[PDB]
C-alpha cells in the first residue's frame, strides 16, 4: 500500500451536489480543504485509477487539471473545476444560439492545443468528442476524461477512425480523426454527427470513402480541414501543431473576408 504524493485522506474532501450520471460512476462538485472547490469522479479499482495515472503525468492549461486521488474504496479522483459543463450541453443549451464562427474557432483552437500538447508527450486520448471538452469561464475550454488515455505503444465509432475502430490501432492520428468530427459538433451546434445513420452502416460508408458535407453556413476552408483530418490515411492526417495554428490564425490567414451570418 505504497500510495504516492498525489494520495490525501477522504476527511479533506466533501462532495456538494451530484453533476451527473456515469457507466464506471458518478462525477460530483464538493470542495477540497474547505477552501478550494473542485470536482470528484466517484464509482476494477486499479484500473478505474488508470485515469489518474495518466492525468499524474500530464500538465497543461488546456487540460482538467488532476488535484488529488483515492486510492481507496470509494476510489476518487479530485480535480479543476469547470463551472460551464461539458461542451457538448454547452452547444446545445441556451448558450449555443448566440456562438458564431469567431467564438467556435477559439473553442477549437484551445482543445487543438490541448491536444497538441497530448501529441508532444506522445500519449493518446482514444475518446475525444464534445461531450469530454469541459468549459469554464471566459470560454476557456479543457479537454478531459482520459479513461482511455495511454502512452502510445467498442468505441463510439462516429467519433472514431475506422482503423481504431476496426483493428484497434488508436494512435494520435485516430485522435485527428475524432477532432475533425468534433469540428462538426461545434458548427452544427451539437448535432450528432452522421444523422440518420446508424453505425453499422457508418462503418460501411466511412469505408466506401463517405464524409459528412459541409455543414451549413460553415466556410469551405473549415470543411476542407475536416477532410484532411478524415484522410484514409492515417498519416496524410494534419498533426495537431498545424491544427492549432490554422484555427488560431483562421480569420486573418484563411477567411479573412468573413462575414457573419444568421447561424454561424
Ligand atoms: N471527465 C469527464 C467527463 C465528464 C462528464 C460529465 C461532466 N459533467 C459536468 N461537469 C462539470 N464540471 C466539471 C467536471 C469536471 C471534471 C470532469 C470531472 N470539472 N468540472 C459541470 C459543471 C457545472 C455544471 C454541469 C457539469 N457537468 C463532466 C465531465
Not at 139 to 150: N, P, S, T, Y
Not at 220 to 225: A, G, I, N, R
Request: negative net charge; glycine residues 6%.
Amino acid at each position: 500500500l505504497a500510495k504516492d504524493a498525489w494520495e490525501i485522506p477522504r476527511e479533506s474532501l466533501r462532495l456538494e451536489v451530484k453533476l451527473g450520471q456515469g457507466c464506471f460512476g458518478e462525477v460530483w462538485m464538493g470542495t477540497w480543504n474547505g477552501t478550494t472547490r473542485v470536482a470528484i469522479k466517484t464509482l476494477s479499482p486499479e484500473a478505474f485509477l488508470q485515469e489518474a495515472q495518466v492525468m499524474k503525468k500530464l500538465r497543461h492549461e488546456k487540460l482538467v487539471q488532476l488535484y488529488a486521488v483515492v486510492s481507496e474504496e470509494p476510489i476518487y479522483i479530485v480535480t479543476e473545476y469547470m463551472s460551464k459543463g461539458s461542451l457538448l450541453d454547452f452547444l446545445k443549451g441556451e448558450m449555443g444560439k448566440y456562438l458564431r464562427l469567431p467564438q467556435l474557432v477559439d473553442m477549437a483552437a484551445q482543445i487543438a492545443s490541448g491536444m497538441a500538447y497530448v501529441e508532444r508527450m506522445n500519449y493518446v486520448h482514444r475518446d475525444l468528442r464534445a461531450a469530454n471538452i469541459l468549459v469554464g469561464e471566459n470560454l476557456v475550454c479543457k479537454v478531459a476524461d482520459f479513461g482511455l488515455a495511454r502512452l502510445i505503444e467498442k468505441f463510439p465509432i462516429k467519433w472514431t477512425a475506422p482503423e481504431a475502430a476496426l483493428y484497434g490501432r488508436f494512435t494520435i492520428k485516430s485522435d485527428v480523426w475524432s477532432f475533425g468530427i468534433l469540428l462538426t459538433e461545434l458548427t452544427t451546434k451539437g448535432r450528432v454527427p452522421y444523422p440518420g445513420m446508424v453505425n453499422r452502416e457508418v462503418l460501411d460508408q466511412v469505408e466506401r470513402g463517405y464524409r459528412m458535407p459541409c455543414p451549413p453556413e460553415c466556410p469551405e476552408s473549415l470543411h476542407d480541414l475536416m477532410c484532411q483530418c478524415w484522410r484514409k490515411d492515417p498519416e496524410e492526417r494534419p498533426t495537431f501543431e498545424y491544427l492549432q495554428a490554422f484555427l488560431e490564425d483562421y480569420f486573418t490567414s484563411t477567411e479573412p473576408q468573413y462575414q457573419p451570418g444568421e447561424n454561424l
